[PDB]
Design a protein around this ligand. Structure first.
Ligand SMILES: CC1(C)Cc2ccccc2C(N[C@@H](Cc2ccccc2)C(=O)O)=N1
Ligand SMILES: [Zn+2]
Ligand SMILES: [Zn+2]
Ligand SMILES: [Zn+2]
Length: 397
């Protein structure tokens, strides 16, 4: 598993994430596993489901050990639940190691496995703090690093039919950075706290124009990098200011309200989409150096996502892939697809460079540029109100 063996090891469907092959058990059971930087459990379908045709069969694994502990994970509209255990785990197209990891065998779920996704489980790559049922279930990547010599880093290159969804590809390089996957400078922003991959946005511009908000609004109540989310999601106030600005720029076109809520497509005749009327968006991330930031600039082709339907086929049609949040900013596939993203856990930082699989615009380029210096930079981080539950739990580690 040299970095050439890991290049191109991701597949997916537009809008249903990216997955990597993993094996579980002995003899090895091969499954397609969602790459999820927004969660911290390794959980696999482990019983029949109408939208799965394989699943982890614990009883066929001579190396499985039951942990005799359930786990139940609610989502906004779905859930998964299941039984904890440990087993041997390998990534066939990753580092040439086998590790004993925790595995949540999903016994029941609701609105979790979707018709046609092709993944059978999820690999939560974020930190122990957000693992369920608690921060004592070691996440996979922590086990990998503790048990082998793989460096404490991984990087993701997420690269951007008349009925069915577009096929996508990408690379997850485990333990390193492959310089063939990016061009230009690699810029790093600090990991603020090690729970989500949390970062701090200091400034936001839409077509070069500053939104002029209190910068804490940008990170209210956090900002995170999440391969498990499709859209760029923005806190309410920031989302309203952004929509106002993109509307202004594109006001040659009056779209319905449902378009701006992502609930309706807008279409132009084939090949005619006026890309020039939709503005670029720049997020400026706090730099490694005090008073410095750098920006990542996304093109309209990243945040307006094509969708082919049956009646709409003389036409190119698009969904607005920026949406309102009440749980802070989420830099999802919409942001990550422009970029090679380095999750440098050893150095508590995340790097961005322009990806080699570039998203194309006629006259503009998605970009990563810096530094930009601020006289008296000042703190853009939000401090989430400390609940009595968080406050009482003891962490004897
Ligand atoms: C799967 C995951 C990580 C967690 C989840 C759980 C339940 C419903 C939707 C989602 C969800 N929604 C994503 C969309 C998506 C991404 C990757 C695969 C499938 C859908 C989102 O809400 O942006 N993401
Ligand atoms: Zn394979
Ligand atoms: Zn105690
Ligand atoms: Zn703890």
């Amino acid at each position: 598993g040299s970095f050439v063996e890991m290049v191109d090891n991701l597949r997916g469907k537009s809008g249903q994430g990216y997955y990597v092959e993993m094996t579980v058990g002995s003899p090895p059971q091969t499954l397609n596993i969602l790459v999820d930087t927004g969660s911290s459990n390794f959980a696999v379908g482990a019983a029949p489901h109408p939208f799965l045709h394989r699943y982890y069969q614990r009883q066929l694994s001579s190396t499985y050990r039951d942990l005799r502990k359930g786990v139940y994970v609610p989502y906004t509209q779905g859930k998964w639940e299941g039984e904890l255990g440990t087993d041997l785990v390998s990534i066939p197209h990753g580092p040439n190691v086998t590790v004993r990891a925790n595995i949540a065998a999903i016994t029941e779920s609701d609105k979790f496995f979707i018709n046609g996704s092709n993944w059978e489980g999820i690999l939560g790559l974020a930190y122990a703090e957000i693992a369920r049922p608690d921060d004592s279930l070691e996440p996979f990547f922590d086990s990998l690093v503790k048990q082998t010599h793989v460096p404490n880093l991984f990087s993701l290159q997420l690269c951007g039919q008349s009925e069915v969804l577009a096929s996508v590809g990408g690379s997850m390089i485990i333990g390193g950075i492959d310089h063939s996957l990016y061009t230009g400078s690699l810029w790093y922003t600090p990991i603020r706290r090690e729970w989500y991959y949390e970062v701090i946005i200091v400034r936001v511009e839409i077509n070069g124009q500053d939104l002029k908000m209190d910068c804490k609004e940008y990170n209210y109540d956090k900002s995170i990098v999440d391969s498990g989310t499709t859209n760029l999601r923005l806190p309410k106030k920031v989302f309203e200011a952004a929509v106002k600005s993109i509307k202004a720029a594109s006001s040659t076109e009056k779209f319905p309200d449902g378009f701006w809520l992502g609930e309706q497509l807008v279409c132009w005749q084939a090949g005619t989409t006026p890309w020039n009327i939709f503005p670029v968006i720049s997020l400026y991330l706090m730099g490694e150096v005090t008073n410095q930031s750098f920006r990542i600039t996304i093109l309209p082709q990243q945040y307006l996502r094509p969708v082919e339907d049956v009646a709409t086929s003389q036409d190119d049609c698009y969904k607005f892939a920026i949406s309102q949040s009440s749980t802070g900013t989420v830099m999802g596939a919409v942001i990550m697809e422009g970029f090679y993203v380095v999750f440098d856990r050893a150095r508590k930082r995340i790097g961005f460079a322009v990806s080699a699989c570039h998203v194309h615009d006629e006259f503009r380029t998605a970009a990563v540029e810096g530094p930009f210096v601020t006289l008296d930079m000042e703190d853009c981080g939000y401090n989430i109100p400390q609940t009595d539950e968080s406050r009482s739990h003891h962490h004897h580690h």
